[PDB]
Design a protein around this nucleic acid. Structure first.
Lengths: 225, 225
RNA sequence: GUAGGACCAUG
DNA sequence: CCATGGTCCTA
C-alpha cells in the first residue's frame, strides 16, 4: 500500500532506462500514487515497492505504444447464422459476410475506449495534464498538479451505460472529474459537458473522428512491418 | 434466509390452476424443490410467501411463452463504423449494412440460450425432468426428483466461457450438474458430454438446429400479426 | 440506485 | 479448476 520513500528517484531512474522522454510524466504519476496509494492498481511485486515502480515504468510506456484493433479469436456459433437467416431474413449468400462483420464490429467496440484516451491525451498533455497510460492507476485516466499544488484528476468512458464500480476515494486532491462521450439511448454526444480543464476547448467529436481516421490509417500503413 | 410457508404446495397448485392448469404439476414440484432449497429461490414480495408463490406462477408460465429475438434498442456508436472503414477496410457503401447485421447478430446471440433451454425441455420433460422456466431458481435450469427421492439439478449454458457462480450451495440434493453446448476455442459441439439422465439419448446438435428452425418459423407467424 | 443474461480478454 | 478485467445489452 504505502509507497517507498524514495519513490520519485526510483521512478526517474526506472523510466530513464525505458524511455527518458516519459520520465517526467511517469515521475508525476508516481508522486500522485504516493499521495493516493489506494489509487494504485495491482500489476508480481507489491504496490509501492521499488520492484513495483520499475515494473510500472514498462507498463506505463507500453500503454503508449500503438495497440492494433483485433477481432475475437473465437469460433462463432453457427446457430447465430441460422437465426439471422430464418428469423431476421438475412440472405444465405450474405451470412458469411454478416458473421465476419459482426466479429470486426466487436473488435472495433473493444478499441474505441483506448482510442478515446489517446485522442484526449494528444490534446491535453501539451497543457500539462498527464495520461495515466497502462494499468497502474485505478479508475483515473488523467491527472494534473495545478497552480495551487492540488491534484486534479479525470476519468473518461466511452458510454454512459457502463456500471462504474472499482473506485476507491482520492485522499489528496479534488474529487475525480468523471465524463462520458456517447449516450446509449439517444443520438449525439457529450463533448459539451467535457470538464473544465486546460485544453478542453480544443476537444470535439469531429476532432475525435479526425484523430481516429488518421491514426487507424497509420496503423494500417505499418501492418506489414 | 427466507423460508417457505408450510402449505406452499397447495398454494402453488391453486395459483397455477388459475394461470395454466397444464403446468400446475410441474410448478408444484419446482416450489417443492425451493421449499427444500430456499436459497436457490431467485428474488422477484418476500421469498417463500403466499404472494411470492402466486407471482411466481405467472413468471413460470410467462417463461414458457415464445420469446422474440430483438436487436438492441440503443443507438449505435458512429465511431465503430469509422473503425470498420479505416482499419478493417469495410467499404463505405457497406457500413450501414454492417451496422444492422451487427445489431441482429447481438439479438440472435441473446436468444440462443433460451432456445437451447426450450429444446432440451421439449426432449427431457416427458421423462420427468422439469424446466425451471421464468426466473425462479438461481443458476438451475432443470430439476428432477429421482427414485430415491433425491433432488437432481442441471444448469445448461450455450458456451464454455461463462462466469461460474452466483448459486448458493445446495441444501437438499446432489450438486448442480453443469453442461455447455459450444466451445469458444474449437469447432464442434459438446452434446456427447451431456449428463446422464433419462432422455439424454434423444438430444443432438442436428436436433437443436431442426428445433430452432421450426421454432423461428412459428415465431415469424406470431409476429406477422 | 439494484439485479440479470450474452460476448470477449488477462493471470 | 480457480479469479480478474472490459465491452455490449436487458430488466
Amino acid at each position: 500500500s504505502k509507497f517507498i520513500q524514495n519513490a520519485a528517484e526510483i521512478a526517474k531512474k526506472a523510466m530513464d532506462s525505458v524511455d527518458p522522454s516519459l520520465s517526467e510524466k511517469f515521475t508525476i504519476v508516481i508522486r500522485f500514487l504516493t499521495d493516493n496509494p489506494d489509487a494504485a492498481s495491482a500489476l508480481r511485486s507489491i504496490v509501492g515497492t521499488e520492484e513495483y515502480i520499475i515494473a510500472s515504468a514498462t507498463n506505463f510506456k507500453k500503454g503508449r505504444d500503438p495497440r492494433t484493433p483485433l477481432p475475437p479469436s473465437t469460433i462463432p456459433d453457427e446457430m447465430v447464422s441460422v437465426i439471422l437467416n430464418k428469423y431476421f431474413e438475412v440472405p444465405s449468400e450474405e451470412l458469411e459476410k454478416a458473421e465476419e462483420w459482426h466479429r470486426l464490429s466487436m473488435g472495433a467496440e473493444n478499441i474505441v475506449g483506448d482510442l478515446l484516451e489517446r485522442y484526449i491525451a494528444e490534446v491535453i498533455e501539451p497543457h500539462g495534464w498527464i495520461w495515466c497510460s497502462g494499468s497502474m492507476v485505478r479508475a483515473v485516466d488523467f491527472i494534473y498538479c495545478d497552480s495551487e499544488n492540488v491534484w486534479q484528476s479525470l476519468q473518461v468512458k466511452n458510454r454512459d451505460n457502463t456500471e462504474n464500480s472499482s473506485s476507491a476515494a482520492i485522499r489528496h486532491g479534488t474529487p475525480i472529474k468523471k465524463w462520458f462521450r456517447t449516450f446509449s439511448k439517444k443520438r449525439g454526444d457529450n463533448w459539451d459537458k467535457f470538464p473544465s480543464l486546460e485544453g478542453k476547448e480544443n476537444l470535439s467529436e469531429k476532432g475525435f473522428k479526425l484523430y481516429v481516421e488518421k491514426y487507424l490509417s497509420a496503423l494500417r500503413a505499418i501492418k506489414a512491418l
